[PDB]
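As promised in the previous annual report, we have extended the structural survey to additional targets. Below is the entry for Fibroblast growth factor receptor 4.
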Amino acid sequence: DLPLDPLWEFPRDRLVLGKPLGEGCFGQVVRAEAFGMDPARPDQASTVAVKMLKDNASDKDLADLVSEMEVMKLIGRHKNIINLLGVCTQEGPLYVIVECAAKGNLREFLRARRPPGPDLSPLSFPVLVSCAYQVARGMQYLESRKCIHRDLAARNVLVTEDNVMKIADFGLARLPVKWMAPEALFDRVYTHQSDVWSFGILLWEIFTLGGSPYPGIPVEELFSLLREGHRMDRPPHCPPELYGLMRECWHAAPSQRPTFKQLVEALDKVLLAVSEE
Ligand SMILES: *C(=O)c1nc2c(cc1CN1CCN(C)CC1=O)CCCN2C(=O)Nc1cc(NCCOC)c(C#N)cn1
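The corresponding structure token record, generated without further manual editing, is:
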């Protein structure tokens, strides 16, 4: 069984499950409608997402879902992360209610909003910087809460109906080798500074509108190329100020990379200037 948390327990009868959003190995995320999620308007319907176990799940999977739920409570609320909204622990399967991100992941959001490409030739430049800045803010918050993400990439950044960026799967208990810092790749060392390296890759994904990192380069060849000091080229139409930030994230020495605080500060300076360009 699971203890009743007066701060988070939501009534099971006020939650209506909908179509699945995605299925993992033993877990899944589904659409849902919640009634009275905001206590100020207790009859209002709101669209949410529900993390739950699949039928093939074991007690190890249940402990992993419980762990993510508890980590989400400990970390607390931020505008730029997928927030916990409530829980259904009593008289039925465990439901972890979280914020809905109607527009899906950032990579597909950007790919669907691309201008005519090189085989032929919507999102303004300030909106793109705002996306980067929002993700930097969310990461700054997670870091302040002792949370190392380990898998920061555009596929793990979700977009709401209101176009707010929300980092997902921060509470979790082929490998994404192209986003990994070299000390993480080679020495299995994951710090806040290795998340800064991934943020640099994410910045490149933003300014290529969902481009695949290291275009052409075989995965096997990546490691040797990084060891030689090679890094990705400046995306087309990307300003040198933003490419400069990417290159700082990609410094070999973790201590030579910027902090999330400096990234938030540098991205806010660009955003405020570019908003009147
Ligand atoms: C949220 O309930 C929601 N999410 C996604 C879609 C639709 C909806 C709800 N919804 C709003 C718009 N109207 C017209 C109908 C409707 O049903 C559409 C597809 C993309 N959604 C999505 O990605 N949601 C989402 C995903 C999450 N995880 C990403 C990995 O999924 C396995 C999370 C989380 N955590 C939260 N929302």
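The radius of gyration is 20 Å. Residues 21-22, 29, 31, 47-49, 82, 98, 100-102, 104, 158, 168 surround FGF (CB under 6 Å). These points will be discussed at the next consortium meeting with the crystallography subgroup.
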